[PDB]
Design a protein around this ligand. Structure first.
Ligand SMILES: CC(C)(COP(=O)(O)OP(=O)(O)OC[C@H]1O[C@@H](n2cnc3c(N)ncnc32)[C@H](O)[C@@H]1OP(=O)(O)O)[C@@H](O)C(=O)NCCC(=O)NCCSC(=O)/C=C/c1ccc(O)c(O)c1
Length: 460
């Protein structure tokens, strides 16, 4: 139901930029090189005519994106994946090659209030607002050239706007990419001389400080060879998802209720660290493991002692040596994995088991002495020995200003991390309406979603 009105290319300004920019791939980026789709969807109430969209909004967006790209030059380039053995990946922007961001201008007749809503949405409707980027746009002698960012802007006439960004995982983590969206909108909202610095929207691309003192680069690269070839010949087009989106909102008061429920279950136990993050993920992890039971598995209690896994990442910028600036643009994640027994998660203290298992995972990865990289040589080998039916991961973070992306028409009505449907993942972001609250985006088949909503709304 989405019709494409225009496909054009957006580049940095010809003047204040340079014909070339080689950015190195750090050992942090190596584990993400197979993920060519990281998806951020933003919805905006926009009760204005379609002519105002095409004659004013679109031209300004094309102008602000270009202005923004003067500070985010590598996002306008590509990722070069070595085609010959004994060569390493890198990033590059080549103005003489025409490297640019594809911007799609589209229109839809689907119902806008439905698509930005918090109750169920067909996943395929969300994924249908995105532009499908090519896997390889060009092939040099040493490497194959892989695009990094494309954005589709869709207009729901007289009702709203959807901004659908796709980014390669290797160029940015959630923190970095959200800073890029906010910079784009900020410049579009306040013009060219807007002060990105004073808004903390200026990135740093200096990777001379990221040092690989543990040889993880060689270690990760060799381990990624297998994963890369799997994802090498896999369909660039969105699979027909069998899942529905639902969104849940936990106020800071409802977060408090969950902490006090853990402190009353504890009943004299080792001081467990309880944050919004641990509490939110704890709660959602318990509901998720229970809902898998209510959809009744024909393996009786045979499983209950098997381990359930919750996989998340953490930002390491502030833990590195040499110091790493907070605005370092790129990947800088550590892998953390919580685990507990199925029977204990579903039991009468499951919430407490999940929070302590998560707080334990953060402590073994970050609070380790020596450093975050102390145990880094196992970050990849650890996430493999985990079964698909016992795995849950989370994407996004409540720390990032997902609802600060105001292009000048107001803050988003809804921010969806659409790439959540490709796996058993959830997403957690800053709540639009509640100061220290969160939004959980869940991605489940309809019948399983029903079970989940039951428990989630239930005991709480
Ligand atoms: C991992 C976390 C979240 C840990 O959470 P958390 O424990 O809440 O850390 P914190 O918020 O700094 O701590 C605050 C709490 O510390 C608590 N605390 C600290 N120590 C203790 C203690 N010892 N005992 C009890 N409490 C303690 C305090 O009580 C604080 O208050 P509160 O939170 O309860 O209100 C955090 O440290 C971190 O690193 N977060 C970043 C996660 C991250 O980087 N995720 C990125 C994944 S990439 C991703 O998912 C998607 C990328 C992407 C790209 C392009 C696209 O287009 C796209 O769409 C997507």
């Amino acid at each position: 139901m989405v019709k494409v009105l225009e496909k054009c290319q957006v580049t940095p300004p010809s003047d204040t930029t340079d014909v070339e920019l080689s950015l190195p791939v750090t050992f942090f980026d190596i584990p993400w090189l197979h993920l060519n789709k990281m998806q951020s969807l933003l919805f905006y109430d926009f009760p204005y005519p379609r002519t105002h969209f095409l004659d004013t909004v679109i031209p300004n967006l094309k102008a602000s994106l270009s202005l923004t790209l003067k500070h985010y030059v590598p996002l306008s380039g590509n990722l070069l994946m070595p085609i010959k053995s004994g060569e390493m990946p890198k990033f590059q922007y080549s103005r003489d090659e025409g490297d640019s961001i594809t911007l799609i201008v589209a229109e839809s007749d689907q119902d806008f209030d439905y698509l930005k809503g918090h109750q169920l949405v067909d996943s395929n409707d969300l994924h249908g607002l995105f532009y499908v980027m090519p896997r390889v746009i060009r092939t040099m002698q040493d490497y194959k050239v892989i695009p990094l960012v494309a954005v589709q802007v869709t207009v729901f006439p007289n009702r709203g706007i959807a901004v659908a960004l796709t980014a390669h995982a290797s160029i940015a983590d959630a923190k970095s990419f959200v800073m890029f969206i906010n910079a784009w909108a900020y410049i579009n909202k306040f013009g060219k001389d807007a002060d990105l610095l004073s808004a903390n929207l200026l990135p740093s691309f200096d990777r001379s400080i990221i040092k690989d003192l543990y040889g993880l680069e060689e270690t990760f690269w060799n381990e990624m060879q297998d994963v890369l070839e799997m994802f090498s010949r896999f369909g660039s087009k969105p699979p027909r998802f069998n899942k529905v989106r639902a969104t849940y909102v936990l106020s800071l008061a409802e977060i408090q209720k969950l902490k006090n429920k853990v402190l009353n279950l504890r009943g004299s136990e080792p001081t467990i660290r309880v944050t919004t993050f641990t509490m939110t993920c704890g709660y959602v992890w318990t509901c998720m493991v229970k809902s898998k039971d209510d959809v009744v598995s024909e393996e009786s209690s045979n499983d209950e002692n098997e381990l359930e896994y919750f996989s998340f990442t953490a930002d390491c910028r502030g833990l590195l040596t040499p110091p790493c600036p907070p605005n370092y643009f790129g990947n800088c994640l550590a892998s953390c994995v919580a685990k507990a027994t199925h029977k204990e998660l579903v039991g009468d203290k499951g919430l407490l088991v999940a929070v302590a298992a998560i707080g334990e995972a953060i402590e073994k990865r970050l609070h380790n002495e020596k450093g975050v990289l102390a145990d880094a040589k196992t970050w990849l080998s650890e996430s493999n020995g985990i079964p698909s039916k016992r795995f849950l991961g989370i994407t996004g973070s409540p720390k990032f200003d997902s609802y600060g992306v105001d292009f000048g028409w107001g803050k988003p009505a809804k921010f969806d991390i659409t790439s959540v449907d490709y796996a058993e993942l959830i997403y957690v972001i800053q709540s639009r309406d509640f100061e220290k609250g969160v939004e959980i985006g869940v991605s489940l088949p309809k019948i399983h979603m029903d079970a989940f909503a039951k428990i989630f709304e239930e005991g709480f």
